[PDB]
Amino acid sequence: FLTDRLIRFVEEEGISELLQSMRRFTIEEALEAFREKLGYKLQDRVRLRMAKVIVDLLYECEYLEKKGERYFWIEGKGFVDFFERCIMYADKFLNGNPPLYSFDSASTGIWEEFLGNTEFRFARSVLINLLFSGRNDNATVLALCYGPGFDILQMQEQYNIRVTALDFKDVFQSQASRRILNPNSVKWVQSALWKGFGTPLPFHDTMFDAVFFACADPYIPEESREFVYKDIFRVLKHGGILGIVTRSYPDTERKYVKDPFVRKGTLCHDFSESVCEGWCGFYHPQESENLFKTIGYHVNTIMLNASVWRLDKP
Numbered sequence: 001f002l003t004d005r006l007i008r009f010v011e012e013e014g015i016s017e018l019l020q021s022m023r024r025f026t027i028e029e030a031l032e033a034f035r036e037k038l039g040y041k042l043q044d045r046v047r048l049r050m051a052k053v054i055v056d057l058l059y060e061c062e063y064l065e066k067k068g069e070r071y072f073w074i075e076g077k078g079f080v081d082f083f084e085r086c087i088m089y090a091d092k093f094l095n096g097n098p099p100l101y102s103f104d105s106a107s108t109g110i111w112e113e114f115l116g117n118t119e120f121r122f123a124r125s126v127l128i129n130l131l132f133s134g135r136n137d138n139a140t141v142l143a144l145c146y147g148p149g150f151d152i153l154q155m156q157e158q159y160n161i162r163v164t165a166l167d168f169k170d171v172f173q174s175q176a177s178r179r180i181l182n183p184n185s186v187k188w189v190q191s192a193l194w195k196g197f198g199t200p201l202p203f204h205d206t207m208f209d210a211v212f213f214a215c216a217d218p219y220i221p222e223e224s225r226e227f228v229y230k231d232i233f234r235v236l237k238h239g240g241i242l243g244i245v246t247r248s249y250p251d252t253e254r255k256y257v258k259d260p261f262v263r264k265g266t267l268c269h270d271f272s273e274s275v276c277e278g279w280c281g282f283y284h285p286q287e288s289e290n291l292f293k294t295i296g297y298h299v300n301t302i303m304l305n306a307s308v309w310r311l312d313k314p
């Protein structure tokens, strides 16, 4: 299991030994001790975040209790995977080595194997039915940040839609074309027309019946996330729909992410994919719902522990 693997990492790197010897710590004190005692170079946001995720996971797994903002180590009384490869590298990354993977040509096979997994296929299929079930055929849909094209493939498997495909790099386009059911029917937009998150989408206002946005939310920088979703709102027709597949950072309130296995799994996913170039991490679900509402979306559906979102433009 992935959680057991990350716990084994925590123990083998001496993180658990350090924290139990400290006995009590705030997140700030723990991060200072990771720097001073383990020698981690927490020199950027993504590495500082990984260290925070480790503490959050130890708390979720009941190694720690919390009073106010202070954690306490709980003393016990007497008597092959993409994720595996990420965790195998995490010690090197935390010591300041470059990201393990990126969205460049050399890494395309890695992403193809990872994003083809059954859990992603399930989440995409649910969202596709949420967006298109019961609709008139041949909706105009933007497949945004489509990568290897599993999203386009599943959309064409399930429904007759007119896909416009856009990514911020063109490194996957040939692989996606050789995967989907109807490559001639797709409007492939050249990646030179869109620098990516933070730049306006190269489409006019109110053009699309739907925007499909799967597994790309955690690559949006915090500084740009409001704009990215406002700009998507701009290109949707009134009555159009934005579908998101992501994960939600486990919420203390347990309002959105309830399944204990999923709460642990999301933390381990976030820690692991932090070794990939550009990872920003999963966002808090209450803040996401608040953001979508202020932009002007109606929150039609939140499902799968707040991993699948249907957002309608009124």
Ligand SMILES: Nc1ncnc2c1ncn2[C@@H]1O[C@H](CSCC[C@H](N)C(=O)O)[C@@H](O)[C@H]1O
Binding pocket: 103, 115, 144, 145, 146, 147, 148, 149, 150, 151, 167, 168, 169, 195, 196, 197, 213, 214, 215, 216, 219, 278
């Ligand atoms: N800074 C950035 N701006 C726009 N897209 C970005 C980006 N960083 C990553 N991405 C894109 O986000 C995607 C992450 S992988 C998800 C691919 C596909 N949607 C699927 O469901 O499997 C990739 O297409 C990647 O090119």
